[PDB]
Write a protein that binds this ligand. Structure first.
Ligand code: NA
Length: 130
């Protein structure tokens, strides 16, 4: 599924993402936007380390989910990476929350640091009723 902006905004809110560990909805939207263009099926193989980025938040198999084909990786979210390819983003949201519970928080995503951090992100949730 390729979410429409406001549709996703409300979906994330309903899932408890607004202010989760201090992270506004706008920061989550900007993240998903840059990571997959709001696309739950998005995937990106990393030829360098044989890992893959799954779903709307592009969570990496090296540490976050298990896909079996990544040579001796880990699964901190304790989920099959396939769950990150569902139209229903509850499993992905659960994993995103697990990711940000670490020291760095949302900075785990390089794209957030580069395209969202210290930016005017109001536009991501404007008119969404969130
Ligand atoms: Na915030």
């Amino acid at each position: 599924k390729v979410f429409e902006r406001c549709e996703l905004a409300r979906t994330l809110k309903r899932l408890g993402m607004d202010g989760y560990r201090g992270i506004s909805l706008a920061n989550w939207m900007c993240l998903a936007k840059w990571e997959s263009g709001y696309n739950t099926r998005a995937t990106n193989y990393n030829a360098g380390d044989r890992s893959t980025d799954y779903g709307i938040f592009q969570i990496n198999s090296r540490y976050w989910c298990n896909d079996g084909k990544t040579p001796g990786a880990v699964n901190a979210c304790h989920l099959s990476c396939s769950a990150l390819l569902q139209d229903n983003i509850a499993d992905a949201v659960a994993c995103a929350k697990r990711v940000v519970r670490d020291p760095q928080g949302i900075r785990a995503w390089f794209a957030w640091r580069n395209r969202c951090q210290n930016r005017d992100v109001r536009q991501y949730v404007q008119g969404c009723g969130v």
